[PDB]
Amino acid sequence: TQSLHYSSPRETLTDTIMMAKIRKNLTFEAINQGTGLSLAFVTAALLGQHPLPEQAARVVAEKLDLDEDAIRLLQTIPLRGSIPGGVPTDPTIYRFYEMVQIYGSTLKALVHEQFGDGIISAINFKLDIKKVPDPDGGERAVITLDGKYLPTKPF
Template sequence: MENKASVVSRLLAVKQKSAKSYSEIAEETGLTNVYVGQLLRRQAQLKPSTAPKLRASLPDLTDDLIQEMMTPPMRSYDPAIVNEPAIYSMSAIDFYCSVDKIKGVDGNDRVVVTFDGKYLSHSEMRAENMVSRIRLQ
């Protein structure tokens, strides 16, 4: 198994050779452009039902790259880059993100970042509400 940096380098070379943008690949696969970026950086797992669509969009993907993308990724964070006290309590359950480019009223390019996720409120972990403890008594 290759190291992650080598796999990502190969995946990004395939994308570059295709001359397609993340948005174009997303449109062809039915994914969001951010998710395509995550796939090509080994931050998300390619699902079997999506593999043929991705291969059609990026025909230079080899069998070994597809297989690598279908394994669960090992995500990691550099503490020098991410230094956020709540980083491990954040959740992305049922969460979508997209990045789009539009023309502003002045004709200049603008970026639109859309976060679309399920709202999960924080709850206080009170012992009296712990159902398993109540049943054990």
């Protein structure tokens, strides 16, 4: 599996993808139909953060009119990172950034209390987002971060 150490070719591909999606007024849910993969994984891949397996790349390529060069690039492992410079200003992204700023020390404390020394993985890891009704009217998003506990063992 090929990989890139710089982001500019994948950012160009992502821009080609987004302009086709907006021109055709598609949803990510619709683009993902037939990949057999979870919506969050494929969306992240279309946005430049994961490789797609070849079959999923060709399924999404048919819906967005991508050429063979684009299909090849969609299968490459990218230089990951979706917030240029690390600190977002967009309010939607910032709220998730803010959760980590405020609750980061609590997450560390409770991980070590309940699991032990080590980390919760961001690689052996699954993300998903669910819309649920709010009991007081309106809607809520339940974002689930599901990661393997990897212990730190004295050697």
